[PDB]
Curated annotation (Swiss-Prot):
Domain PUM-HD: 1-361
Name used for this protein in its record: Suppressor protein MPT5
Keywords linked to the UniProt accession: Cytoplasm, Phosphoprotein, Repeat, RNA-binding
GO terms assigned for molecular function: mRNA binding; protein-macromolecule adaptor activity
GO biological process: intracellular mRNA localization; negative regulation of translation; negative regulation of translational initiation; positive regulation of nuclear-transcribed mRNA catabolic process, deadenylation-dependent decay; post-transcriptional regulation of gene expression; regulation of G1 to G0 transition
Additional observations: Present with 1240 molecules/cell in log phase SD medium.
Signal peptide boundaries: none
Organism: Saccharomyces cerevisiae (strain ATCC 204508 / S288c) (Baker's yeast)
Top-level taxonomic group: Eukaryota
Pumilio repeat locations: 6-44, 45-80, 81-117, 122-159, 160-197, 198-235, 236-270, 288-320
Amino acid sequence: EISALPLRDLDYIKLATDQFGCRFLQKKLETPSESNMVRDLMYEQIKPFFLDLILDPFGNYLVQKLCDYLTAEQKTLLIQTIYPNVFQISINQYGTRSLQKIIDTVDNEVQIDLIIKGFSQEFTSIEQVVTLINDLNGNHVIQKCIFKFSPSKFGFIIDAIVEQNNIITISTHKHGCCVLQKLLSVCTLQQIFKISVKIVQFLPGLINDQFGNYIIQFLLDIKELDFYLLAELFNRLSNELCQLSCLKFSSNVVEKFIKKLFRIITGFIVASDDVINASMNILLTTIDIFTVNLNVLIRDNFGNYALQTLLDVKNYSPLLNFCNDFSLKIGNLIVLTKELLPSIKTTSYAKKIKLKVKAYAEAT
RNA sequence: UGUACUAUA
């Protein structure tokens, strides 16, 4: 009986909030003969209520559907109407879906700059941006921005991250750490630098955090950061390297760090020159620390993985006068390690370490 | 022997 009515007489604002009414409208937008007609008729009636529909359990579906048919002028007017409410929209269960879809179908820079304006401090505080980055619903909007927009629009995200100690609030959060990684995967090198400075600054609250440890590891995979990050991290952590190797989360960073030293030095033998220099030094100094603390590391529930990584010839066979020092030091660690094998007979991983001293012997 | 992946009829 609803289908018997001319489109001109429909109560669109009433149908948008109704489930089956909304579905009916979406179906009309999908019927090519009536799509433009019903789009224009419904648009004029619902435009005072754009915010209301965006936040609505059924209305949000209509808004999403509309995004596939709206003219550039219609979409622009829509965004002009709701850009100051991006925070409230983003934390909303239904709003997040609407906004993602809107960002996903922008037609031009005018529209993008309007959304970005709404995320600026004129309408959304730094603290609110931090909230969005960690929010169950909002983090998806921030991600959409990251994958849809040019990094030249990332100001409000970068500004919020580097403010005071927000790097902690974000990197140690279950959603924020994921968001931060996606950002780093696509943003500009200079944007990476600014965030890395803050990450190094608050390293101790990050390196053994359940989520923060993934951030430190993510940085170690960015080659453009090698020229400073290796020396910078080692200098913050050297004095507690043994302790860090013996902790659940940071133990994985130590391994990642040791592997990275190996890949960099061996890549030279088989490639930035300055890195290599200090990478060789850090590696030698690391072997020394692990040699000194061998008795604790070989015995520790987490420390033994770091030790085994350092001892595995799969990682350093091209290295067999740095090669000279390395061979003496890694050889001596092997000797001392095997002397200790009977003192760990109990442990379930003794055979794994026996296998590595053996593999060393076969290679040498 | 050892760590994270989230949301609408």
